[PDB]
């Protein structure tokens, strides 16, 4: 997921920087929570994971607004419809993250890892639906009437 | 600028930039559409998934190939496939790149006319060209004198060429290819008990065919060996954890190529088709065509097809002539590498069908130019 | 002596003597076993009831069909069924009669191998033979050129035949049949409030389907008529005196055959399956296959299936060809009558698998002979 | 079908008359059933059609026996093999006619035209396989070691 | 060649029975154009040359430009990759290999036989093609009897029933004496 | 092929030496690869054969440029048209050598003799089209308005 953003190099070019920055923050928090899953990471308390999930939800709302602006700026095409579909998915995931974070906070306060497993899963679903929102928004704003490098050569022989 | 080379086969789409040596995008040519009922709001807005995103989500889709036997049956789906290739996979605006498309020989003329019309009116390419696939395979084989067996997923065709002069009366197009072998493998898999019926299960059977199936050098001896002992059985694990075991179906599926009577077809196998295409050419060039049997396309990658085809042709050709089958390890991408060689040539840049010519003469210019 | 003809279908067992025109024994293919607790001494010694004695006592049994989708899943139960058929129903010693068994096409090979082994080792028959069911239906239809749609309780398969020469590459076996329609009727019956969950209640729902359900000529118009007025509602009385009323479920249950997407299956209906099987045959015989659409099996007895299928095929076939569906009034027993015709032939008596041949070659002789 | 027999004019010449008489009876019954199909004919009840079908089956058995006798009298040749093939076809058709006639009789007794359609079809198949049995038997018995007129001249111009 | 050029429209006949269907299409529809280039121009400009045929399974095909392209192979055998000259140049070359005094009598009697010479318009086209090769003075006329499909057999009837001919049969006794090589002496 | 160059002895005479030197280098590399085919030679690894093929391609581009200069210097004639045809052939062969060398390099890196067989074949085609480019260029520049010896006497009796 990180590689799809990492091929970005420096409408679009006006709100593009904000969106790429938000996606990069999302990926940073995402691997924060992933490292929590693996055991060693910046955040070690389930409360910290809930705070990180709420942060990802807030970034998702912001990126959703920016991508909606780009989407209505652009012209009718297939990539616009893909972008709108991904925006709906981001909306659903953000709502899930909010309410589930509040529920897990209350459950933890009333008195472990499996509490944060579902939050990590929902945030990972959200992130997967963002790297397809930046690409669709970029293509819809640019190719129709930052940068992304052309894809790498496919191997001729696969062992 | 730099020219695109889109080799839209019947089963796989292989695109890239001219002058390179490997495609950038290689994804299946399918267009899935969900068939179940969506219950979560916001999920299900996307009506159709194209290429690699319909191969991951195939559990809830009906995959439909737009190209069928090398002939584009569905045109809206193929516009979807081309849009995917240009924008989402290669990530290039088509307005700035000439496009070199490929096509099997002996297809309908409406096929070329509508590919040209779609490229010049929907994608607004500045130039294009449609090239026969076996010619490009001979380009990429590093020769100028050979007979190019070019299997695939749609068709299997020969094009005999002697020193850059193709012989159009000896082109033998056979409509038996990888997809017929997949369907026959499904049929013979029903014998063991495994019933694959859906489209996603066609893709599972295709993967079984790619992983396990091979070509027997001697069919009767291999059937005897498979019946006598269980040394030929190999197991495959389905996407839900089940394990299958096919011992005799391994070489029976690709034997359809050499005996097309397995699936009810009358025509002769690929060995007799190649030999008949050779002895339709002029007598002086048969010796040079015998020694250069370039094999291309995906379906010619079964383990042991070169040895078997050499054995089958050597039994037909005169005892004196030297038969040798050329099977490069990269032969799956030979057509595209030939497209890279052709589109990047200095000599070739006067042979594009420019947009101005299309405006003057309409979509019937592709028959004159190509 | 006189040969037996045991047509062990997936839902009913129909046995008799070759040369006759009607079976002697026709009983369901179920094997019930009591599940409650026996309290009276001497009652409850019998561990399992088979066939008709398990359909009377179904209130205290768990009926289990041994054959499931034409494939014998349970072999001890099917030995029980065959023992019942031979001794308690037909009342013949198997040692003195050849047996002609029937089987759907495209079944596993272990199925034929184990039927042969059980007949030759457990029942000691002197000879046997396993015949595809649609071939026998074409025997009993009085023709030699037709396409035999043969529904049933397990499977629904086509076999296109032209002048005694079957086309094995155009045999289209679909696994949608009467039992799936029974389960779908249970599902849609839950809408009105009636919940049938047990196996005995599966048998009650099967009887509802047989008595009331029919096939609509035009589905949308019939749904509109059923929603507008209550002229389509018919009542059925359950075995405990309760009265049910199904108005819209009458033609929705058998519509699963023409739209197998009702029960989540992807494959095309029986009309498209028949048409696809026709246009897989050689071009010269499609006109003769269009005019002889022999329909067999129990499931093809819904009131109005011939007219609907003719309407559905006529919309697919070219406007010139003459489509007519052949639906004999006895089509439930067409396979068995074909078995009587085949087993009593003078020519056929050299084609039995004699016991000596089985001793020589083992249970793999059935693949060569049949 | 009638024309193929009608070119007969008066081993073979010992059992030939019996075979030609049987074939003529078959054709007479056949057009009886055909006229039933067209609406007007000697027989008008489906029971009558079933009786006619059984009669044709009996004649088929008799003609099969006679032609088998001629076939084993004759010498090895290609026409003998054609004759044996047609005899097998006649056997199959006769068995079909018997059993299907009994089945249709029971169906009609338990309580229309389509009931007799298949019987007419099977009898017509039987008749087509007889006019090729009389000719093959005649040639095998005579030409190798009644009469049939030489074939008519083919048109030079076909409009 | 008709099967090959029929693949252009979309119709693919591959089997032997489908060879027979294509043969029937050729017999029913195909004809010979008097001027090939003008007929190609007419066929491309308008759809007045398209005629439909109904296959044995009810399908309808439509061939407009393949009608005169199939029998044009006779006059341009380079369509199917053959090098040799057309039937008009073959006839003219056969005429000018004969002695000079009999070319005038051979020009005026061009008997055409066999089935393939029954395309509608082959006599007029062949006369036009030969007249452009022969000297402007000589009178070219092609003899095309309506029964020319059976001309060889009618000639066999004339020859075999002659009174003079009955001494030219290869009798069985001669074959017994001399073996199967007698046919080269007698015939 | 070597003999055709070997009859050269010392527009043309200004760029002739460069062209003859390039052709001689081509022949030296060509028999290098041929000796690799026979088993014993200066280069023994398939990577070495790929490097040699790329070198021959570079020499082909240089010789193509020089021969094009001579061709446009010269006057209209038949040998000029032959020279231009051979230049087009050299262009095609050089493009094939480049792309196929890169493809074989990748195939060998991803993990034998038959890999170098096609490169040897293409280089041999290129060389055959050069010894006909030096001769045509020499004749077009010289005979119309180094050296080549007159051809040897043909045998009077061929055994
Ligand atoms: N390794 C393999 N072994 C056997 N068959 C293969 C293999 N790889 C691909 N195929 C067959 O080849 C087909 C792909 O061929 P492809 O190269 O895509 O031809 P095209 O590009 O003309 O469709 C697939 O459908 C598959 O059945
Ligand atoms: N009159 C009828 N109307 C509708 N469906 C019927 C009728 N009779 C039987 N069926 C269905 O057909 C099935 C019996 O088919 P059958 O003839 O036994 O096939 P098989 O012998 O292959 O099992 C039953 O399960 C029932 O659902
Ligand atoms: Mg290909
Ligand atoms: Mg049945
Ligand atoms: Mg003739």
Author numbering:
A (entry chain L), D (entry chain K), F (entry chain Z): 690 to 699, 710 to 810, 817 to 850, 861 to 874
B (entry chain E), C (entry chain F): 5 to 374
E (entry chain D): 188 to 374
What did the paper state?
We eventually overcame the challenges that bundling posed for cryoEM structure determination by first applying F-actin on our cryoEM grid, followed by adding HMP1/α-catenin versus using both proteins simultaneously on our cryoEM grid. This process eventually succeeded in our 3.4 Å cryoEM structure determination of HMP1/α-catenin bound to F-actin. As seen for the binding of mammalian α-catenin, the carboxy terminus of HMP1/α-catenin extends to engage in hydrophobic interactions with HMP1/α-catenin of a neighboring HMP1/α-catenin. For example, Val-809 of one HMP1/α-catenin interacts with Ile-872 of a separate HMP1/α-catenin polypeptide chain. Specifically, Trp-711 predicted to be at the end of the first α-helix in the unbound HMP1/α-catenin FABD structure, that is also seen in our unbound human α-catenin structure, is instead at the carboxy terminus of the second α-helix in our F-actin bound HMP1/α-catenin structure. When bound to F-actin, Trp-711 fills the pocket that Trp-861 occupies in the unbound model. The extension of the second α-helix, by borrowing residues from the loop region, no longer leaves room for the loop region of the last α-helix that therefore becomes disordered in the actin-bound HMP1/α-catenin structure. A S823F mutant has previously been shown to reduce the binding of HMP1/α-catenin with F-actin. This is consistent with our actin-bound HMP1/α-catenin structure where the hydroxyl of the HMP1/α-catenin residue Ser-823 is within 4 Å to the amide of the F-actin residue Arg-147. Given that carboxy-terminal truncations prevent bundling, it seems that the last ∼20 residues are responsible for bundling.
